[PDB]
Symmetry: C2
Subunit: 292 residues, 2 copies
């Protein structure tokens, strides 16, 4: 009978695992991690809808009036239509690291009426726990966190835990967005989206969890046309062989079919270059082929 | 800062002026009056958005849960997403007429939490007011109407007044719908929509502040294809002469362009038959041109 919907923040200095945490929270089988300097004007970074709950994830602790009108334009709603406020904040930090950049973010939060969760990422990396406890005690000394939760974004350590608090903070309200609305309407996202389907379609029963599509390059040329470079990141090594398939079949197909739509959708032929890769890093041979 | 949005009803027995009153409220220059005896599952009949206010006009006094689930689907929202309730009701009646149908509607209303405005339509068409006063006093005995207001079907007598009470009844809330959302996603509406553009594109606003498009026919054949019949309705006579244009050029163009998008925007071919008409009834020649095919 009742539904809940609200905005939630995910802040932290760059390269802390924010994007990885977001994808785990969005709960999509095949995710789409973009690398944009092109900061949205609405700051929406993803929307998780499930049952009566709709959490709208933003990358700002507080939503400006400017950001409120932009969210409305995104929804094609009157600029005057009411938009709430951030109800929770997930402050992500990296293990035992603490730069003036981490403080910069922390400084912007404390000065708010929104509760904040400290998400300590890559906590397993710190092989010297003798660094951890002292650190965590120093962190908690920075402000009153609603909670301090250590996570592994690539394992989903305490993502369910953060998922639960997040929902507890969704105010009673009607959803602002239709279920599968797109906040990224760029061609670059359209591209990632076509690859995503081809993987889902062609991998079939062999699709593993945690796959991530991403456009490393989308451009035109001095000779004209659309140069698109797809990056299909996977968790394991053997998984990488799946996406590639027998003789290179599966990755061949996914690429022709994906290129097809990229052309049917966009209005220009595209030279699509699809690269499978394990998130832990390229391999020797791969690093070689990546230079050819 | 604040914003308001809520559902409002427009009830009444058929052929009373509900559709005309609605278009007047929607405030659109060129309106699109359907005739869909096919009743929606969401019951949305139109949405008036302006500034922070968004009134969602339905054709049911009260929204059933089923009618709520359908509204969400229309918006492509989770079935669970909250939908409010009818905050006001416009019960339109025809002049001095009162059938068991008028009563049927009024009975459903009597029992409800929704304030209801009595809209007396075609009031200027009553043969003798000596029928009106006794009637009204008898209507106002049926229940406590928030207000009793007489309106003119095509003049928009007190449409502003009904508009102003309607907005007063919009609860504080966020707009459920994007500004220009379409509640009718049928091809029949897509057609009406194309003629609207062509009128707006070619008439160039020289246009009658009250034109009304309408698909009088949209079908297939025993021989196959798409038989579409457009009905462009205007107020005055010269207006009709405007839409037709010199040598019949304007109406010729509006139809080739309209037929085109209907050709493309739909997958197959269309036999578009566009007919201009004054709402006050056809003419002799026209009736002659119509009475054949």
């Amino acid at each position: 009978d009742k539904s809940y919907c609200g905005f939630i923040a995910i802040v932290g200095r760059p390269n802390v695992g924010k994007s990885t945490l977001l994808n785990k929270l969005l709960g999509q089988k095949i995710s789409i991690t973009s690398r944009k300097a092109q900061t949205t004007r609405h700051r929406i970074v993803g929307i998780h809808t499930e049952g009566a709950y709709q959490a709208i994830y933003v990358d700002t602790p507080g939503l400006h009036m400017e950001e409120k009108r932009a969210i409305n334009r995104l929804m094609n709603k009157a600029a005057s239509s009411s938009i709430g406020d951030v109800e929770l904040v997930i402050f992500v930090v990296e293990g035992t690291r603490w730069t003036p950049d981490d403080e910069m973010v922390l400084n912007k939060l404390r000065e708010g009426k929104a509760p904040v969760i400290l998400a300590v990422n890559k906590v397993d990396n710190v092989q010297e726990k003798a660094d951890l406890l002292p650190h965590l005690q120093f962190l908690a000394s920075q402000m009153n966190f609603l909670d301090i939760v250590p996570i592994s974004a690539e394992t989903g350590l305490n993502v369910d835990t953060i998922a639960a608090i997040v929902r507890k903070h969704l105010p009673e309200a009607t959803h602002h967005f239709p279920e599968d609305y797109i906040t990224d309407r760029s061609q670059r996202f359209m591209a990632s989206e076509i690859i995503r389907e081809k993987l889902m379609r062609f991998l079939g029963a062999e699709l593993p969890y945690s796959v991530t599509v991403e456009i490393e390059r989308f451009v035109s040329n001095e000779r004209g046309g659309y140069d698109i470079n797809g990056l299909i990141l996977v968790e394991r090594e053997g998984q990488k062989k799946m996406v590639i398939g027998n003789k290179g079949a599966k990755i061949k197909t996914i690429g022709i079919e994906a290129r097809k739509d990229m052309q049917e959708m966009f209005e220009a032929p595209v030279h699509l270059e699809l690269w499978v890769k394990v998130k832990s890093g390229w391999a020797d041979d791969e690093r070689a082929l990546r230079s050819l």
